[PDB]
Amino acid sequence: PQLDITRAISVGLVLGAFILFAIVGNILVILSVACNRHLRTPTNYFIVNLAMADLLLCFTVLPFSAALEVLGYWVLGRTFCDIWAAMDVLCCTASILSLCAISIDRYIGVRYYLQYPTLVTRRKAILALLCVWVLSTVISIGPLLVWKEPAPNYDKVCGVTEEPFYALFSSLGSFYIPLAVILVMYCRVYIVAKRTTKNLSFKFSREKKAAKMLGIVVGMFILCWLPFFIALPLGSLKPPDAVFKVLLWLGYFNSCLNPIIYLCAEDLVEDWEKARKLLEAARKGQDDEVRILLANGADVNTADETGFTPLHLAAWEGHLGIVEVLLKNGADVNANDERGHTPLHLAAYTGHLEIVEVLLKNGAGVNATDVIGTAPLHLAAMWGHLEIVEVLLKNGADVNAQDKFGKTPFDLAIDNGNEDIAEVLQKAATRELEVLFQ
Numbered sequence: 001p002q003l004d005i006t007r008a009i010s011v012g013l014v015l016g017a018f019i020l021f022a023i024v025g026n027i028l029v030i031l032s033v034a035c036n037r038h039l040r041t042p043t044n045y046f047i048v049n050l051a052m053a054d055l056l057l058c059f060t061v062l063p064f065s066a067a068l069e070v071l072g073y074w075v076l077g078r079t080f081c082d083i084w085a086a087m088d089v090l091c092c093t094a095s096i097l098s099l100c101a102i103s104i105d106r107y108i109g110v111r112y113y114l115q116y117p118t119l120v121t122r123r124k125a126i127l128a129l130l131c132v133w134v135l136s137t138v139i140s141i142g143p144l145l146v147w148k149e150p151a152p153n154y155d156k157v158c159g160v161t162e163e164p165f166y167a168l169f170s171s172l173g174s175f176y177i178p179l180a181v182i183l184v185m186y187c188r189v190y191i192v193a194k195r196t197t198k199n200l201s202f203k204f205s206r207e208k209k210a211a212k213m214l215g216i217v218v219g220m221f222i223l224c225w226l227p228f229f230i231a232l233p234l235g236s237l238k239p240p241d242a243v244f245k246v247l248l249w250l251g252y253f254n255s256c257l258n259p260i261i262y263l264c265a266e267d268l269v270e271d272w273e274k275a276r277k278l279l280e281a282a283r284k285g286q287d288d289e290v291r292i293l294l295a296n297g298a299d300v301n302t303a304d305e306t307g308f309t310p311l312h313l314a315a316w317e318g319h320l321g322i323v324e325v326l327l328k329n330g331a332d333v334n335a336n337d338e339r340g341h342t343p344l345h346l347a348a349y350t351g352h353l354e355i356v357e358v359l360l361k362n363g364a365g366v367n368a369t370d371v372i373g374t375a376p377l378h379l380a381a382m383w384g385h386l387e388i389v390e391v392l393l394k395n396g397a398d399v400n401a402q403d404k405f406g407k408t409p410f411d412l413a414i415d416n417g418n419e420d421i422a423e424v425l426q427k428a429a430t431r432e433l434e435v436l437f438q
């Protein structure tokens, strides 16, 4: 029994990973939509409800599961087992009925690319969410009233098992009937996305991108919960109590997968072909192509294998037109590569005054430092880009900024015999003494 020690850490790390994504991850998903007015979209309305269901499990289902394993058989069915039988179904029924609202929203979204925005608003989204909880409560808390008094002979309050009238009636209303709607709708979405993808406004690639991310979510839920919900009806015609325990735990694990799916899935950058196409267009300075590619569904914030985005390479290669349209198409102006360089670092290096001003105008980090601690002022001062050094200082660039090698933008100007820049950087440093000078 030497493995008993190693099993603790392995399970503990997996349970720690779960809690992290399931509680913190979901709260962060909720807060991102809650504190951004531009992110309050009907699709984002359903994922907040999906995160609320995962959160509601963690606080009202897992405590009962944790209390069982830790303390043992303090399993007082009359109350204890009735609450976290009821709460368990409620959360699961809420989750799958939310995925029904998603599966339908995504068919309305994919099929009707330019019609959807008007069709589905915040008002129509709240009603769909409202319905889910009204149904979910009836489906979950129904049986707890319908079957009021405990059975004679063979009661199983504190067991997943029961008679066929519950095993089928519950599993139908809580899984299979919802599953039918989902699979039928995401089967319909499946073929429309190919039919319009073969045939082919960016709207289709914004909503077929959305349909793909959420399709993974829908699949991972089905994959997680099918094993349990296969075994409840199938038992009536099998599994030990210890078998049911891991099948439920598998279902619970899904609560952490959603935040992970949103961090781990590339679908906006799913078109590896269309993604690397834009990265090249923006670098080569091909305004016609970049505009066309963006309009055809190309991700503005595509990450290179090194970490460079189209805005990086555009700022580097000195293509002002592409920098403007990228920003105009919602480009991360403070995008970082592996060493932390932003497009302003690159614009500063290659001496493009036009782009440095445009980046700053669009809210670029003037003092943004890379892993070495090198700021855009370090690079502009190093190569003799005096116009950029002045623009940078004007936007409040820090002259005292130091890299890992202890070198400051002034030092680099001196060490490259840049007399003009060194004077402007030395003057800039005595700014605090010009409180006395009016």
Ligand SMILES: COc1cc2nc(N3CCN(C(=O)c4ccco4)[C@H]4CCCC[C@H]43)nc(N)c2cc1OC
Residues within 6 Å of the ligand: 081, 082, 084, 085, 088, 089, 092, 157, 158, 159, 160, 161, 170, 171, 174, 232, 241, 242, 244, 245, 248, 251
């Ligand atoms: C996700 O959907 C469902 C979840 C459900 N969860 C329970 N639980 C949760 C905890 N259980 C066990 O751990 C467990 C281990 C072995 C048998 O049960 C049992 C036993 C203790 C009391 C609550 C029970 N009971 C249901 N009847 C149930 C029904 C569901 O849909 C039809």
